[PDB]
Enzyme design. Structure first.
Site, short mmCIF file in Angstrom:
data_model
loop_
_atom_site.label_atom_id
_atom_site.label_comp_id
_atom_site.label_asym_id
_atom_site.label_seq_id
_atom_site.Cartn_x
_atom_site.Cartn_y
_atom_site.Cartn_z
N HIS F 115 0.81 -1.21 0.00
CA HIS F 115 0.00 0.00 0.00
C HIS F 115 0.85 1.26 0.00
O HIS F 115 0.43 2.28 -0.56
CB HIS F 115 -0.91 0.01 1.22
N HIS F 179 4.62 9.11 13.97
CA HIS F 179 3.60 8.15 14.36
C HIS F 179 4.32 6.89 14.81
O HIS F 179 5.56 6.84 14.83
CB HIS F 179 2.65 7.83 13.22
#
Lengths: 314, 314, 314, 314, 314, 314
Positions: F115, F179
């Site tokens: 992805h 993150h």
């Protein structure tokens, strides 16, 4: 001071093997447009860089650069034949100045030239004897070969010399782009081929010339059949090269080795060194800008045809 | 690494016009002593710089430097004739490296050489075929001429290349000192003389060779009669030149222009450029020192005879 | 600050041997136009560089540069004769400043000058006594000769000195272009000619002056018959030189040796060094630009006539 | 390479006005010792710097430096008279090289010299014709005058030229230390004195020479009476100068202006510039060291007598 | 600090095709002598540069340099098989430091190695598990290839890192000299050969390995028959290369392009890059010197066998 | 020349865990606006930098940079799957030029991408096969990691190469901002996890992929519950970073060490290196300027979403 530059691939295969006629028309249109631009410029002196194909220079002596004080076209491939209007005294002064500047330049008083010198003159000026000429030969076939660095140096030397003639100067580059005709190799040459390369090739009989022409035509048709029979064309590198020239970044070409280029594009590509010289020359006239860029691969003629022009902005 | 250098004037007039026999004995003694020193050195490779006298190179193509992959002595003036033991592959590697280094060097596969290449080999090694040779021709007669700067550059290039062969190398310089033989001039040449200079001089008949020899002998005898009939010898400049070489100060020779030297010492002096090349080469082998310096003017032979040797101190 | 510059070939042959009268008219028109431009400029001080022809300086002492605190024209070739309005104190200050600046400049209090100093004054100002003058003599005949480098240095020194006089300054250059009059040579001079060169030439009888004039006229007519009897004119180099001056690139003239120039253009060309000095001077006044460029070879007068002017842009 | 240097004040007053005889003996002893050292050195070439006293150079032309290709001593003050053994060709080569190096040097083929050139030769070599000579004249009387900087430059040029002659060279400096003879001044000169200075002083009658000698003798006796009638001697500056020379620190002399020196020591001091030249020359031969330093003020002879020698350490 | 270096060609053809047994004895003697020298040195850590032959790295990912934290020899050609004593933590620290230094280095935790890693260990240490090892793989087969410049940089990085381990270090180079085995090419590879190159070559069946071995043996025998069937060996360039290494002049190798080397010596020559790395490393340990130089062409094994050693002088 | 740049965080969590729907609308609006701007630009070539998540590269070989000549998206997380339109020949030329420029770049002919390569293409161009692509993978998970310095160097190399293609180029950066997803660690990995990391992770069963997706979703929800369960987001550093990029001051990022960044923002932040590369590339096209800056922290998706665009000003 004013200067105009033009570089153009030369087609030995004109009227022998031909592509779709529309492409031929487009090519001729480009040629005519460039010719008109030059005629508008109205030059007084023509400096002509060009390679040879084993017609006057042979392994008896093979210089990297030569300057022709006296020249004669032998009319190969049906091209024009006869003498060339060389301004002897100007030529000698040019040779002296160039060699003084630090370039090691051979000279010749009876030079034999072929279509590589004829076609550009005919196509761009309509004859051999229109304008005074300074023929300059650059080796591009027989190893070892001059590098890009030295070629640029030579171009700059000639440019700075001619910049002080107070004339309007036209520079020509007559080397085709990436391609590969069937050129004999001295390393694998037999006894007779070696003898021809050594210096007996000045007096090739018409039979041998026709045989060589047929070899070129047959190899071209085979290359039409497949690009892997020889080195396939490299459009990527061609566009790379022209774009590098347009942006005025020839310095970055110094990093390329001769057999780097041979591996990437095929050994016949070395002709393009003429172009480099031309551009270097014009850089000695102050700022300038390009135009007329055109390129097209052609299966029928092994060459990838190209053309370019540039002009000083006074 | 080890290297030995020797420079020696060449006498085309040996046995034709002769000085007092005692002087001849002294000359031969010097030659023999140098020969013995070399034999003690026991070389493996010979690099030979020499000029020509219109025997293989003609105005069809005249390069400033040429390297002979294949060479042949034609036996002029009764000198030796025959082929020379050239290590082909080594020669090609040398040419490639030199040209890559930034020198524009012609190559030839069938070179014709004359006494200028023969006499040093015979006198210093006792034959043509004793040791592998790398003949290098330097133009010294036909203008324009390479300058001192470029000659030094060429010498350095060859020196650094050969320094990595892990051999014992002998450098030879075969140019005479200030003098003037009766050399034809292209500018004032007639039609036949021009044709001979253009390239038909490779096949001079024995009658023409004998005529040229007689011209040289007669001009030499006239120069014996008076040094003003031609350019008188310049002992001052000769000693200047040799002393500059001995002290390792060849850099200061760059300031001299070709026709500076022509005016001071006469146009035939350009032969000495060979010497410069030789010395430059040895400077690539580390420190060194000279010896065997000898000089003497000779009225009988137009030349001012000279000889010099040098040796690396390991 | 304001400055005007003009350089002009001098014609000793005026009214002796003459070309087609139309050419004469064109020449006179150019002269008149320059004269009018100067009269518009309205100068206050005149700096005059000029060569000699064996009239006041002789081998008793021959300096490379001399400055005339006191000068007198002897009226050779029918030119004007009499004294010159030299501002003594200003001249002495100039000499002091120049020599302090690092130039080795001889001085003289009774200088004899010839047409080389007269004709420009008459033609451009209509008389000797119109404006204060600073006569500066530059050797251009007797070897050894000053180089281009030092001449430029001298010009710059005088320029920076005069730039602080708060006046309007006119610089003149009076050296002809490439040519060759029949000038005697000390090396081949006989006893009497040597004696004349040594210092007895200040008092040449009118018979000897007439004989020398006849020699010049006859040699000029012979040169009309053929340019190879002496050194043929070199239009190429003349245009080269003027164009180099116009573009403000005199730095590149340093690379030329004296006998380089002698070989290319003939030994009499050294007169043009005056021009160089003039231009160097004006470069000390800030930016400037040229005009009035004119050139024409003349078979009848050995000289290649030329003229040029320049002006500061305040 | 080997070089010997010696500088020595010259005494025009020898046998005219004399000090205590013991001092005379000491002086002669110093002279003899230096002479013996030189004879031990056994020179081959003599370079001689010296000033003039209005005997050959006059305001018709007054150069800062001159080189005498031909010289003749006129036998003033009872000094020797006759020609000098000048190696013509060597002299011309020297002039050419020096001027090429960037020094503006006049030349002369018939130079008249006086005791200033005679006494050193007689005292140090026992005659005029013992060794080849290169007479070099340096202006030291008539303003404007060359500075220390340029004099050092001239010395270096001659030094580097002679360093390559492969000979043993002797440099001489013949300028006295601080003193003041009664020298006429052009600024305050009358009509007759001005005429004598302008160039008519070459043919001074014996009556005028005797009158000038009597002027010098009377002024010397007056200076004996008091040092304030003229500029008193400056022993401090003399020792300063010699010590600066000994330590090899001539660079620091550049900071001194000509009229700085004139104010400190009196205008006749400029003679010492010869010394500077000499030392500069020897610095071109590698390292060296001094010896034989000697100094003594003398009331009777206006001069402060001095002497110095130096020698290269091979 | 102490360091020992050794470079040695690897012979896959041992016991398959063999030369005259005497040559074999000489080779084994050289190997044994080097082994004894190393055993005298008694190393603690071994850094091993080596190439691959399509055994663990395949076109799934092909890095220019890789470092094996975990390695395993697969026992090709009958060479040893099994794990290698890698000091994991030391290896990770080395990788971190190298990459921080500015080199882009891949890492691997399960590396498959072949005879190229086995033979040197067996021949020089008598087993795989004798000493801790740091296997470093350098690509030398699949274009594009790292240049000499980057290889030298990598060597220096590893050298400076290991210099601070306070150990005795042995560097190994395992690339043969100029030669050419029959290596498949991806460009002309068929579908199956391409699949093998892409990553399925880790699990080649023994049949395929035997087939490849037979291909190598047959090509070697053909090369014995003639050196032109493939690229003939270049003894000249081999000696050039080793001599350049010995003199500590690896800087000059930067000028060579990859396909320069490919053209001169044949594409398999790139293995020698390992040698360069090794030498660069040792240069980080201070001064050093070479020894044990040995070279010999071998027709039977395509390779030109060579060996060299060097040692730091503490 | 023309160039457009865009960098955008990638959201693996799309449709799994979602924030307030209004925020989702705002995000989609930003995406659509950027898409429209690009469609206006109409690119011809797409250069795509992106990281991986253990899908094609595994510890069998882990390079710092890799270039995909052949690529295939495996359709993870429901993203698109299939091949990518890679211009093979152009890719190979790019690899050659980059590696020549001095960057050590691995290549691959069958690359597996996830992805991280899919989402930007779908969102910004509406499909995989719209435009030719040059996928470039940058390691950002497995230590050791490339530094900022080298990443900038890589970007510049690719930029200068593509600048000469005479095309319109679009650069993409696909790394999210600070993150932390739940990424496995090799150091604490068990036997099975280590085996998966070593190279068996190319063929993860759908069960394992779903398990990893559930791990990511659960860790994201926990991070929603508290930012201290993992590294809390650092809005300050995010804004710092983007502002540094906008002002064109990437040079100052060299001072940051990898684990400096790891400590400040958490180890997953290294993805942003892609952004740096992108910006460096565009700096090779001349001046430029930014726009479309947008940022927003999101508790629901661990990432701090960001987006930026830039465009050359022709």
């Amino acid at each position: 001071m004013h200067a105009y530059l033009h570089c153009l691939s030369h087609s030995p295969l004109v009227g022998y093997v031909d592509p779709a006629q529309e492409v031929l028309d487009e090519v001729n249109g480009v040629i005519a447009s460039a010719r008109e631009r030059i005629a508008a410029f109205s030059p007084e002196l023509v400096v002509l860089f060009a390679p040879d194909h084993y017609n006057g220079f042979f392994y008896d002596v093979m210089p990297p650069f030569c300057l022709g004080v006296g020249a004669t076209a032998i009319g190969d491939f049906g091209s024009a034949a006869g003498e060339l209007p060389v301004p002897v005294e100007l030529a000698e002064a040019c040779a002296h100045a160039v060699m003084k500047s630090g370039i090691d330049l051979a000279v010749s008083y009876c030079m034999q030239v072929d279509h590589g010198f004829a076609q550009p003159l005919e196509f761009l000026l309509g004859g051999l004897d229109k304008v005074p000429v300074l023929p300059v030969f650059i080796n591009g076939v027989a190893t070892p070969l001059p590098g890009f660095q030295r070629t640029r140096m030579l171009g700059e030397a000639i440019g700075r010399f001619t910049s002080t003639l107070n004339k309007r100067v036209l520079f020509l580059g007559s080397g085709g782009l990436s391609h590969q005709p069937p050129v004999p190799e001295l390393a694998k040459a037999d006894a007779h081929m070696r003898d021809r390369l050594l210096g007996s090739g000045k007096d090739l009989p018409a039979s041998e010339r026709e045989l060589r022409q047929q070899r070129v035509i047959s190899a071209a048709e085979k290359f039409v059949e497949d690009q892997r029979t020889l080195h396939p064309l490299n459009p990527i590198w061609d566009n790379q090269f022209m774009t590098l020239l347009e942006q005025g970044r020839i310095q970055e070409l110094d990093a390329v080795s001769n057999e780097e280029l041979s591996a990437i594009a095929g050994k016949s590509t070395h002709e393009i060194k003429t172009w480099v010289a031309a551009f270097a020359a014009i850089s000695a006239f102050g700022n300038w800008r390009s135009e007329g860029r055109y390129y097209r691969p052609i299966p029928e003629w092994i060459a990838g045809f190209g053309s370019l022009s540039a002009r000083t902005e006074n």
